[PDB]
């Protein structure tokens, strides 16, 4: 007795979920709407801006879909920000804004829209979309993608939205999921939005723990105190980092070290190998011959 549900009949009549769903990655109910193109356009690719947030890293991609598999136009990473003068705090709001502005300028250099559609080179924290220039080509339209991530008012996913918008791309959006948005009286507080761009929310928390609890101020901010970084220096880091991105955003790969075959030679030492069918039946001969007289 008890239950005994998992029988031969249950396994035979079980429809497996695709695989991406079985892992817990993709939502196909959302992806049907995002990927599917208007059929009067035939073969115009529908670009979508992927944004993901792993532990201590941010990922950003621009993706086109085909029958064989998805093709990447261009991609950027938060661990490349060390080149532009940012070491600590790679999973902040300011990193997501910096990564978004980096991604846009990579793609616009390939397509050829550097001078035309520059973006916003002043930044007061305003709600704006990139306007089309008269007697010329329209801006590069990219739709925003989320995945299985939650959407709330003031989340890092919508920081990358404005990064791509301020970079030059026409990413259409509303004002109501940026930080400093009054819920009752629907208006934008531009002062509170500008602070999150230049690492303001973190630099205020520097001032509080500096005077108050010194144990937390040594536990947190080890790298800031080790590399000699004061509270008011945070404005100069993210301001100068934005200018460096608008200069040479080309992507250059690493030195790598060792060839692909040397990695393959090292990796195959530890990972195990299968047996032949004769060696399987040799183990059966051992189990029979050992347990025939019993020991």
């Amino acid at each position: 007795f008890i239950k005994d549900i998992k029988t031969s009949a249950y396994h035979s009549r079980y429809q497996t979920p695709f695989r991406r769903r079985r892992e817990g990655k993709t939502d196909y109910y959302a992806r049907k709407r995002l990927v599917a193109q208007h059929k009067a356009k035939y073969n115009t690719p529908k670009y979508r801006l992927v944004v993901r947030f792993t532990n201590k890293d941010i990922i950003t991609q621009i993706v086109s879909s085909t029958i064989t598999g998805d093709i990447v136009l261009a991609a950027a990473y938060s661990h490349e920000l060390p080149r532009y003068g940012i070491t600590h705090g790679l999973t902040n709001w300011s990193a997501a804004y910096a990564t978004g502005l980096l991604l846009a300028r990579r793609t616009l250099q390939k397509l050829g829209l550097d001078e035309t559609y520059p973006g916003v080179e002043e930044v007061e924290g305003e709600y704006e979309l990139t306007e089309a220039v008269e007697d010329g080509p329209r801006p590069f339209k990219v739709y925003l993608d989320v995945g299985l991530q939650r959407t709330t008012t003031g989340a890092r996913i919508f920081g990358a939205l404005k990064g791509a918008s301020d970079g030059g791309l026409y990413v259409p959006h509303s004002e109501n999921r940026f930080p400093g948005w009054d819920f009752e009286a629907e208006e934008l507080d531009a002062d509170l939005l500008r602070t999150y761009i230049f690492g303001g929310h973190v630099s205020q928390y520097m001032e509080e723990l500096a005077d108050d609890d010194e144990e937390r101020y040594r536990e947190l901010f080890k790298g800031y105190l080790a590399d000699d970084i004061d509270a008011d220096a945070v404005e100069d880091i993210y301001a100068d980092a934005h200018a460096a991105i608008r200069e040479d955003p080309a992507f250059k790969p690493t030195e790598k070290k060792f060839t692909k075959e040397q990695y393959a030679a090292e990796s195959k030492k530890y990972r195990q190998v299968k047996l032949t069918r004769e060696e399987r039946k040799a183990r059966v001969a051992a189990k029979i011959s050992a347990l025939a007289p019993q020991e």
Binding site: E23, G24, K25, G147, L148, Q149, R150
Partner: protein
């Protein structure tokens, strides 16, 4: 060897059931507010029974969730009433335990003539680090058999702490 498998109290859930509606319930709500500090949550009926005497969607029972350091105090408060002596029931196959008391006059508190007298149902779930595996949205999965909690292992933990016994 055992570094990560610490075995700890994850949460404590107090529950006070009643059989009627209205004013007696609202008194029992303020007992758990003094007990815990948090505002409790009110359950309600699934279907009409009649023999006990409650309709469907009548609204009757109350409960509250307790986590962290505040849960460990209220557990020992309840065990002080039970003389640190639980039976060999009071323990699931998965290794979660609980016990019943009558009257909230014990474990601190007072009579307070206006509010009245009520019993409780204590219940504690036990787990290990890596319970986020099941509870998170992105990438859900089952837990391996070595990491799962059992009855015998939880009783061995319970004898070590608290100065307590199994009796049966």
């Amino acid at each position: 060897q055992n570094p990560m498998r610490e075995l700890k109290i994850e949460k404590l859930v107090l529950n006070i059931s009643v059989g009627e509606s209205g004013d007696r319930l609202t008194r029992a709500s303020k007992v758990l507010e003094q007990l815990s500090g948090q505002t409790p949550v009110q359950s309600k009926a699934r279907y009409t029974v009649r023999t006990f005497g409650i309709r469907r969607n009548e609204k009757i029972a109350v409960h509250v969730t307790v986590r962290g350091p505040k849960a460990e105090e209220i557990l020992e408060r309840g065990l002080k009433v039970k003389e640190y002596q639980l039976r060999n029931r009071n323990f699931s196959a998965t290794g979660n335990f609980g016990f019943g008391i009558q009257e909230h006059i014990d474990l601190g508190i007072k009579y307070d003539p206006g509010i009245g007298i009520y019993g409780m149902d204590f219940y504690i779930v036990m787990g290990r680090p890596g319970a986020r595996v099941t509870r998170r949205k992105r990438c859900q999965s089952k837990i391996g058999n070595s990491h799962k909690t059992s009855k015998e292992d939880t009783i061995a933990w319970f004898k070590q702490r608290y100065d307590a016994e199994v009796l049966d």
